[PDB]
Amino acid sequence: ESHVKYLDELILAIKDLNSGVDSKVQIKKVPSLKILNTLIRNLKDQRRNNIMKNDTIFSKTVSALALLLEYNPFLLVMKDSNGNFEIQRLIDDFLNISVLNYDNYHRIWFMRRKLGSWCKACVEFYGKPAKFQLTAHFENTMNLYEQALTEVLLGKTELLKFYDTLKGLYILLYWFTSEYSTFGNSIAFLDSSLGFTKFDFNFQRLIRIVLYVFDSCELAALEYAEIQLKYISLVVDYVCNRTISTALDAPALVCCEQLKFVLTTMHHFLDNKYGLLDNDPTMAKGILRLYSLCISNDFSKCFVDHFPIDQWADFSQSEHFPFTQLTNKALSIVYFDLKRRSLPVEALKYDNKFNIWVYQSEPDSSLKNVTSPFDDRYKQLEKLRLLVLKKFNKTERGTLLKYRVNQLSPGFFQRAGNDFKLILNEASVSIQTCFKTNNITRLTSWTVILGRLACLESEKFSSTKDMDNWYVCHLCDIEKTGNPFVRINPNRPEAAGKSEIFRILHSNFLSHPNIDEFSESLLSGILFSLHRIFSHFQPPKLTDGNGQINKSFKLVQKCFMNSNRYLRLLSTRIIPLFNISDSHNSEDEHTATLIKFLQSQKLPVVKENLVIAWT
Amino acid sequence: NMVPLNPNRIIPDETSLFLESILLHQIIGADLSTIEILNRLKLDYITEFKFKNFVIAKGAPIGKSIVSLLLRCKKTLTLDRFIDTLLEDIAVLIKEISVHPNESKLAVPFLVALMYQIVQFRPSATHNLALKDCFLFICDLIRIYHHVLKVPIHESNMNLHVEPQIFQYELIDYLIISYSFDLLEGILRVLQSHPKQTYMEFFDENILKSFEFVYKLALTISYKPMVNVIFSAVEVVNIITSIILNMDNSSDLKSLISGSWWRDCITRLYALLEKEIKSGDVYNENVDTTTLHMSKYHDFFGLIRNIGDNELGGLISKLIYTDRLQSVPRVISKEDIGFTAPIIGYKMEKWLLKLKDEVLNIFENLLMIYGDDATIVNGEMLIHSSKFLSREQALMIERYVGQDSPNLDLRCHLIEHTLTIIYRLWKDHFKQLREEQIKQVESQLIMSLWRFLVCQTETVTANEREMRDHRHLVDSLHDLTIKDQASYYEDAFEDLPEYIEEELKMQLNKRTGRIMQVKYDEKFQEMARTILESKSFDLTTLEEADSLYISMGL
Amino acid sequence: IIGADLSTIEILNRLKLDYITEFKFKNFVIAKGAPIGKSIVSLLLRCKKTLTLDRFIDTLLEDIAVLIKEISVHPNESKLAVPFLVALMYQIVQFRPSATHNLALKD
């Protein structure tokens, strides 16, 4: 359909209508409410089935419609109102389009993050009064759903209607199973934080009452199988956002009460078995999410004790556990790892077929799913497998920032891997050749690696500090208080002298014919590179007396002459870094030079980060 | 379309599941189910306790008796009754072995923990009277343990930190306090999700006053507090405020809670927000309380939250003999507890960060509890709030970006949110702010708004070219998170359907932009602009707003 | 049991066995000062959510029976376990006729 171009015309019109002035939000009403019909129609025709179920084109048209309501911010300051709340007559048909998008986790996270913006943010202009009535109507809807969830326990409902009532349950539920970054005080129960919002255990109560309702009322349709396996998916989506997001290690939990709750919940669902469904990696997905959360951390006895599946073990079979094929596969995997570090791991050796440690599996094979892979090319499935299995690496089980310096260009640890010098020389030769005109993505990842690795060659001179142990640096990256630059002591080593990273970086990213301007953001990237390399390493002179600001301080100045915050403030931070020194701050020649520099510019863009740099 | 009655339901006896989740209940790092840790404890300064058939005889493991109680009142009560009855009984036990100053009160911590596992096993039916009972109860217990919550900021000469290096009883006291503060949170939760037709009961001046004394003992502005208790107290404040909003007939109970009493909350809570975080020495006696530490000397998780390493949970895996009917328990040690994994400090700081999210959001919740207001917000919730907002702008800039650590994005999201708090205060609560305090902090206000303002045009990328380089130099943590959510942590975000990465390239990019001081959502940017360009009040001098804006334009 | 004034599970909780520091049939961790009853409660509890009615019975029968044995064939230790273990076996056995299964009873 060409209604793709119809929505294109409407979004081009709204983009044209910016505001009275060029900058386009206008928090307050401008009674000029001309796109009112199109705005209503956005959701009036969202209840259709032609291209209202498509993504790509139509999806970005809806993303542009969200930007139009932020370009009009709040027209309710003098207009846009209804009998009760108009923001709720929006949310309700948004939840209709949600039950349309009921299953697609994509289509639900995106929609409720933008409506998050709408409620947690785009009414957050005001807060109290609109929020109050919004929460009132939300609680009304919740009570209605709960009262409807009762009479289906006794059979006097429909079949599709029952499916959709329990699905609307799920939709409220997932809408509610994210972390703070998705809502705020808009909804009554997602307002607090630190392991509890007024939701979290209103929600545990929800989950346990609905387990009651499930063991009370059921039906044998595979769609119902799905709208229950999605519920175990959500009862672990409960915890995924309730994690401290530990970089790249499986994210430790904020609250071991989510841990015990979900343990109890999916273990009672091992019991329930309600609605088995074929072709379902969701089951083992949840089990391995949670075990990933429970690998070998202090949560160990927690998981094994409050979710013991082990009592479905039965080594004497090749059809091992009774839930579903690939589930029981990965669950025997998790089981078998449990047994692994239970028994003496000396009884385990790396048998090298799949190179994971294996103890004596059994005299007879009896291990059809001991280590094998199984997926319809499902990278998530096999990566669950691999992380959990190799989690007892007993070798290179560390890193996050250094692991990212390797993630972009995968296949990169095919060698020493631990070794600093391999990435040293590879990024050297990269910036020596690896660009023609467009290497402004991978070269950029090499500059973030150059910064991190400066901070690593700082982590050293203190026995094993290589890429191995690196979630973030110390002298630069453990956040502090006080005068932070107290930490940065001049007795540090000379940059170029004790960093070939500096030598060849000074050659390449600093003696660039286009360092003046090749990619503003890449400029700021190498800027933070210099920031950190200096924070760790003694400063070479900015100016050698006879001019030549050191083709890096030159970047400081020129970006200090930016047009917005970006390159400008990213420059400002490091002036002091050159100042903290000795033998170049000896006669404070550096100090006086940079004092004259902070007084060698008055351009209006830069008064702010000027006052920063001075500070 | 029948949904059939299943004429042979198997529906759990949740009191039985509770009996289980008690007898098995094990704290994080313990050798035993903490119930059994009780179950190996006889005490010789309480010969014989009873409240209602709870004889901890002269020869009883406090466990032996408590588990037996579980059995008795299991036969007696129904679920709500059993919650109430364990509350009353286990409590009056906590007293009689707490106000008895010569006996091994290490039952008490796990007894409180049992309060916790009770109230938060069935917060559905737990009810106001016993709620307040245990609330006020361990409140007076914390007034019992005045010593540890109020230990000199640095042990001024005369006072010496020559303590027996003892998380032994340090655990006893601290554990009780934090566990019971989490129990206060869970009691607030039973009422917090309880119908707001019935909110005139668990609120009373006794709740408030007990919390006065305990809150003031924990947030010890003069002595050296500990961060589990600080967390826990401020969390209690938080949920308190949550219900101060979520109570429908709000004026009456807002009259009940004294204005000076919120004021004595928020003097200490501003004190908190102005206390800071020194990771490198967070596990070391640092400066006078201006360095939230949670020192390894007093270091475990807590209950609805796990902030420390809980290393001393391992020494709870040496808390009792585990092979002996100990009268006094096995050491836990302040010295033994705590170049290894500063991820410890990082996750704990990600907490303290989320703590100050709590603090900002409940300052914000105060902002809502009054639309017409009183002494707690008198322009002071602009002074201190914007002081935090600008302190975090200055810290994120001067160090934290480039410090490029796990904290970045969480902190920047939440301090842009405290910006939004400043916004709604300065728009709706614009009524209160008077000249004296808009002059005390004209500074902070105007220039924090200016800092956020120098961004919108953003001629740098406006796209995913190398602002994704920035997403790598700082947001590398959230890059690990996009990798982890697509490869480990979403059933559907593997094999992306091509309508989502088109969005990712710019969305995660403006995420890292909000990290790196720029490209805050047009929402955010015009919030910050309209806070300042609100010429209705001469926060800016009209003849110099041009010199202001010309850093960007306008 | 008449005169055994206790929750006989607690009775069991008062049964430590130093010599045997290694025990595990269906997850039955036991050590020196580690009470038979501590592992009894261990089982009872998580076995409730794991096992069903009769499979709970059978699991108790066989596990606590392995206990019956390895203490019985352990003449060096004393067997205070087996009397009340067997008393537990009886509460099990009695609990229902129809629920209790003849296979378990056989074993």
Author numbering:
A (entry chain F): 2 to 32, 44 to 474, 480 to 632
B (entry chain D): 189 to 526, 532 to 747
C (entry chain C): 215 to 321
The authors write:
The ataxia-telangiectasia mutated (ATM) and ATM-Rad3-related (ATR) are apical kinases that orchestrate the multifaceted DNA damage response to a variety of insults and regulate genomic stability. The basal kinase activity of ATR plays critical regulatory roles during normal cell-cycle progression and aberrant activation of ATR signaling pathway can drive cells into senescence. In short, our study reveals a novel gating mechanism by which kinase N-lobe toggles between two alternative docking sites and recurrently commits the Mec1/ATR kinase for substrate recruitment, confined catalysis and product release.
Only one state could be stably classified with a resolution of 4.0 Å. The assembly adopts an asymmetric conformation despite having two identical Mec1-Ddc2 heterodimers. The whole molecule is significantly compressed, with the length and height have been reduced to 200 Å and 155 Å, respectively. We refer two monomers as ‘MMS-mono1’ and ‘MMS-mono2’, which demonstrate similar conformational changes at the domain level. After the Pincer and C-lobe are superimposed with each other, the FAT and kinase N-lobe move down by ~10 Å, whereas the Spiral of α-solenoid moves upwards by ~11 Å relative to their positions in the structure with the basal activity. The structures of Ddc2 and Mec1 Spiral domain are well matched, but the conformations of Bridge and FATKIN are significantly different, especially the significant displacement of LBE. FATC rotates 110 degrees downward, coupled with the displacement of PRD Kα10 along with Kα9 and Kα8 downward to the left in the range of 8~12 Å, which more significantly exposes the activation loop to facilitate substrate binding and catalysis. In MMS-mono, the kinase N-lobe packs against the HEAT 25 R/26 R (residues 1005–1090), in close proximity to the Ser1333 residue in human ATR (corresponding to Thr1092 in Mec1).
